[PDB]
Amino acid sequence: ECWSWESYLEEQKAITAPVSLFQDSQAVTHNKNGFKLGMKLEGIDPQHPSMYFILTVAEVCGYRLRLHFDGYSECHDFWVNANSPDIHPAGWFEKTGHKLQPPKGYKEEEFSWSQYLRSTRAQAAPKHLFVSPPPLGFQVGMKLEAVDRMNPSLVCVASVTDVVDSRFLVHFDNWDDTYDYWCDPSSPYIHPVGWCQKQGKPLTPPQDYPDPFCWEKYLEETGASAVPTWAFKVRPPHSFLVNMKLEAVDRRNPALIRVASVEDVEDHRIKIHFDGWSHGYDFWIDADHPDIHPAGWCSKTGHPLQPPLGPREPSSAS
């Protein structure tokens, strides 16, 4: 007999995370996935979020797709949801003044969609498949303080370097742009210039800044203005409680989604445990991350769901 949530919840005496705790985009099950194998498009490199590449749909599964970097190895392939704001239709970089990192084999000047499509005999994913007005008060060139998410104990001097639809790219002055990340005005990882001084927290200055540093001086040195204080919005803390159950993508094998439980909570983050598995794979994740979903999301969208790991298996709990 088919595994099911209804059945597992009774066996376990457990509850699911209510749909209302999730963002609409994490919850929505009724949109169709119109992406097909072979369709071509543009997208940010998730491991280098300031860069745009040409991408091909390598696989479709329920409401998700596996994207491949044209010309490059399969080892960089990655997964997104069909409502990803981090992909764009063919032509987007040109119309929005963004730069392209071309497919392997091509110098940048030698790239043109119309020739490439002919050369590869492939179709552009149509524009209507893609979700992606501006974030009030965040403009390119403005400066702010922001948590390095690779080193979360550090709040650092930062600038806005890209604005795309309702989001902006946070960049860390004079550090490599692999540390960049996208967010919106409600992000709890960003703060106005001066926050650290006001809170007593230490501030990480620009890399190799002479004599670590004063904001007023640095704003004058650069002629940049601070993101204004009114622009920052407080996101409410999430309402996920410990033991609530949900579905989460497996970070070790991104293709798979598993039955999951909330192991721990912060204001803005949940720690996920995969039922039946050792606690060694427990991981923190932002409550707004695209790859957590309520119970039912896989069944309703057409994606396989991994049931809890059997008792006495390798890598199992107890």
Strands 292-293 and 283-286: unpaired
- Could you give the CA distance from residue 46 to residue 51 in angstroms, rounded to a whole number? 9
**From the CB of residue 109, how many other CB atoms can be counted at a distance below 10 Å?**
7
Assess contact for 260 and 246: CB atoms under 8 A.
yes
Q: Give backbone dihedrals phi and psi of 279, rounded to 5 degrees, phi first.
A: -75, -5
Assess contact for 79 and 254: CB atoms under 8 A.
yes
Q: Give backbone dihedrals phi and psi of 234, rounded to 5 degrees, phi first.
A: -80, 120
Q: Which of 88, 93, 97, 50 is nearest to 67 (CA)?
A: 88
Residues 251 and 268 reside in one and the same domain: yes
- What is the distance, to the nearest Å, from the Cα of residue 123 to the centroid of all Cα atoms in its chain? 26
Question: Within 13 Å and on the Cβ side, how many CA atoms surround 284?
Answer: 9
Instruction: List strand residue ranges (DSSP E) for 83-177, in order.
Output: 87-88, 143-147, 155-164, 167-172
- Could you give the CA distance from residue 197 to residue 283 in angstroms, rounded to a whole number? 31
Assess contact for 244 and 16: CB atoms under 8 A.
yes
Which domain does 277 fall in, by range? Answer: 1-31+238-318
Residues 231 and 140 reside in one and the same domain: yes
Residues 226 and 152 reside in one and the same domain: yes
Residue with tokens 């599964």: 61
| Reported resolution, Å | 2.2
Assess contact for 179 and 150: CB atoms under 8 A.
yes
- Could you give the CA distance from residue 226 to residue 146 in angstroms, rounded to a whole number? 13
- DSSP secondary structure of 28-69: ---S-----TT-EEEEEETTEEEEEEEEEEEEEETTEEEEEE
Method: X-ray
Residue with tokens 């948590």: 147
**From the CB of residue 313, how many other CB atoms can be counted at a distance below 10 Å?**
11
Residues 272 and 282 reside in one and the same domain: yes
Q: Is the CA virtual torsion 249, 252, 280, 12 positive or negative?
A: positive
Q: What angle do CA 68, 70, 73 make, to 5 degrees?
A: 65
- Could you give the CA distance from residue 185 to residue 138 in angstroms, rounded to a whole number? 8
Domain boundary residue among 132, 147, 164? 132
Assess contact for 209 and 251: CB atoms under 8 A.
no
Residues 182 and 210 reside in one and the same domain: yes
- Counted domains in the chain: 3
Q: Which of 222, 229, 218 is nearest to 191 (CA)?
A: 229
Q: Is the CA virtual torsion 312, 315, 317, 318 positive or negative?
A: positive
Strands 48-61 and 64-69: antiparallel
- Could you give the CA distance from residue 284 to residue 265 in angstroms, rounded to a whole number? 9
SS3 label, residue 203: strand
- Could you give the CA distance from residue 235 to residue 119 in angstroms, rounded to a whole number? 47
Residues found in the chain: 318
- Could you give the CA distance from residue 212 to residue 92 in angstroms, rounded to a whole number? 41
- Could you give the CA distance from residue 62 to residue 147 in angstroms, rounded to a whole number? 34
Structure token pair of residue 77: 């392939």
Residues 232 and 253 reside in one and the same domain: no
Residues 51 and 124 reside in one and the same domain: yes
State the virtual CA torsion across 137, 209, 196, 154 in degrees, nearest 10. Answer: 100
SS3 label, residue 141: coil
Assess contact for 45 and 103: CB atoms under 8 A.
no
Assess contact for 87 and 55: CB atoms under 8 A.
yes
- Residue 97: strand pairing partners: none
Assess contact for 188 and 235: CB atoms under 8 A.
yes
Residues 54 and 6 reside in one and the same domain: no
Find the CATH number of the domain harbouring 115.
2.30.30.140
Residues 147 and 223 reside in one and the same domain: yes
Domain boundary residue among 202, 237, 272? 237
- Could you give the CA distance from residue 252 to residue 106 in angstroms, rounded to a whole number? 32
- DSSP secondary structure of 257-308: EEEEEEEEE-SSEEEEEETTB-GGG-EEEETT-TTEE-TTHHHHHT---BPP
Residues 137 and 233 reside in one and the same domain: yes
Q: Which of 45, 21, 31 is nearest to 131 (CA)?
A: 31
Assess contact for 181 and 286: CB atoms under 8 A.
no
Domain boundary residue among 108, 132, 156? 132
Q: Using the CB atoms, write b or e for 66-78: b if 16+ within 10 Å.
A: bbbbbeeeeeebb
Strands 48-61 and 40-45: antiparallel
